[PDB]
Structure 1
């Protein structure tokens, strides 16, 4: 089997992407944030504290003929941005882009933090990291990908995120029309439960490539590119008037600037992030200070190849017995 679903930016900045997901019988379609940096499929629901729901579509298990309480199971998760959610668990039928899993754990939120409530466009998360990170207790649950894997034509999914445009998540096949040149594959460590890999270096604009190992994670659920402070300083030093602002919480730059590209290495191959991808617009409405899309990972404890980086590539998440990542230009 295969599946193929379109993923759509939630706003004009590509702050996140949402993908429609069918849950239950008859189908309830929720727009979920596919997150290769976490491993829980959780939704706004009929159980969510009413004051914490503001415009989201909810899952109502009582209206699904295939929903079953997973008795005694609870979940609770905290993300890198400080947000959180928790609740109880149902099993139900879940379909993505025509690919169906029966018996998927659907984590129903009883509580969500303010950043979830305030984002009316995201109805929950669908985690695509390794199932070792899933938070369900006392019986850990599998991701949608892990449950689908054995049925897929190939044990893979791909992320093809758009810049200010829709893109695609495919399951079980590699669309050879969706990228240019060849795919370069690189090793993955699953020790921390992430799609963790090592980039071979970077370049800023038309500058020379610096060969250096940068360990980090491929994380579709993170907006920005978080890299070591040395790398990030070298990038922003090429932008007149850019500075790190402790009041704003990262590097800002004049909205009048033209940003240089940023290249990262994948083995001997190179992915180029155009400068425009690094502009996250005014820090507050009407400001002439703009927020940068490349930020320091200092204090986060890991480098993160978030959407800024991934949207410049066609990315293969290879879930074979020995997982690997693939990157192609597009």
Structure 2
């Protein structure tokens, strides 16, 4: 079909969002990641002991191995995954591509194994950063975009509730008002953009913020200057060394945080900033430092209050308030 949509649901505390997709003859839940250009899956090649409890892909009659191709992805916490590659049919809510490069996991870390609801990743960043070697592969969106009514996909992640991913069109029932666009910087392979300004509570700043829209990241990661400024507004807040971030009394009042895009305000309700309970009557904040990254990451904490349009023409990023 020229258009299609899929339901996406969050795991506990909105840590990640999983979306069902069909790969070959199998159906499994993958993490749609606009910060990655790889589509990898738990498979029949993954050790039985490592895929226990997971839905997985078994390369069948429609699979065509890309002989000699390998892939490997490493994460901050140390988690990793790697394996080989096959081309096969991938279908996302009616939109499919018959020969999508599917990266089969031959090994994954204990963290991945323990996260039984997560059976892989479906990268939505630019193909320029796909990790397959010796020759990188095209992402799903890159393969199907010309066949869509419009070369775009949109995301409306939600807090503790079902959300959606739209391909080839925007769904007017998911947002209010009109969509406001801003130019995208894909030089690093990400959906990079620059917010014109921001505001902590009712205190606005005329300074811009440059970063990327990443559905695969849990929190809203900003510059220390801004993170420190935000928690200065939260009574009892403090940096918890053992938690690796700012925490505060679970009952503390949290101000909203918004960023300005053109004439539109993308507001993160203070409610979403109270991320997770860490015991002792303390809560871990949804806003944390982007230290080490070099730039800001507009992750799920931020995205789940917005309807975001990823437009390949430009490219550009659009924002609108969720209905």
Alignment-derived partner of residue 45 in structure 1: 43
Q: 1:200 to 1:81 in 2, by over 3 A?
A: farther
Secondary structure of the 1:212 match is coil
- The 2-side partners of 1:296 and 1:50 are apart by 38
Q: 2:240 aligned with 1:251, yes or no?
A: no
Tell me how far 1:247 sits from its aligned partner. 2.0
Structure 1 unaligned segments of length 5 or more: list them: none
Aligned positions, number: 321
Q: 1:80 to 1:38 in 2, by over 3 A?
A: farther
Q: 2:267 aligned with 1:272, yes or no?
A: yes
Q: 2:280 aligned with 1:287, yes or no?
A: yes
- The 2-side partners of 1:289 and 1:208 are apart by 25
1:109-128 correspondence to structure 2 within 5 Å: 109-128=105-124
Tell me how far 1:80 sits from its aligned partner. 4.4
Alignment-derived partner of residue 167 in structure 1: 163
- The 2-side partners of 1:83 and 1:260 are apart by 34
Tell me how far 1:54 sits from its aligned partner. 3.6
Alignment-derived partner of residue 298 in structure 2: 305
Tell me how far 1:257 sits from its aligned partner. 1.5
Structure 2 unaligned segments of length 5 or more: list them: none
Secondary structure of the 2:166 match is strand
Alignment-derived partner of residue 17 in structure 1: 17
Q: 2:4 aligned with 1:3, yes or no?
A: yes
Secondary structure of the 1:329 match is strand
- The 2-side partners of 1:150 and 1:37 are apart by 21
- The 1-side partners of 2:181 and 2:264 are apart by 10
- The 1-side partners of 2:188 and 2:270 are apart by 31
Q: CA RMSD in A?
A: 1.2
Which TM-score applies when normalising by structure 2?
Answer: 0.97
Structure 1 range deviating more: 88-97 or 175-184? 175-184
Structure 1 range deviating more: 243-252 or 76-85? 76-85
CA contact (8 A) 2:80 2:109 kept: yes
- The 1-side partners of 2:113 and 2:294 are apart by 27
Secondary structure of the 2:242 match is coil
Give deviations 1:192-247, integer Å, cap 9, x for gaps: 00000001121112x23111111100000001000001111111111111111222
CA contact (8 A) 1:255 1:281 kept: no
- The 2-side partners of 1:43 and 1:128 are apart by 15
- The 2-side partners of 1:165 and 1:258 are apart by 23
Q: 2:228 aligned with 1:227, yes or no?
A: no
1:1-330 correspondence to structure 2 within 5 Å: 1-11=2-12, 13-24=13-24, 27-61=25-59, 64-205=60-201, 207-283=202-278, 286-320=279-313, 322-330=314-322
4+ residue stretches of structure 1 with deviation over 4 A? none
- The 2-side partners of 1:177 and 1:282 are apart by 33
- The 1-side partners of 2:19 and 2:186 are apart by 25
- The 1-side partners of 2:114 and 2:281 are apart by 25
- The 1-side partners of 2:295 and 2:82 are apart by 24
Which TM-score applies when normalising by structure 1?
Answer: 0.95
- The 1-side partners of 2:122 and 2:246 are apart by 30
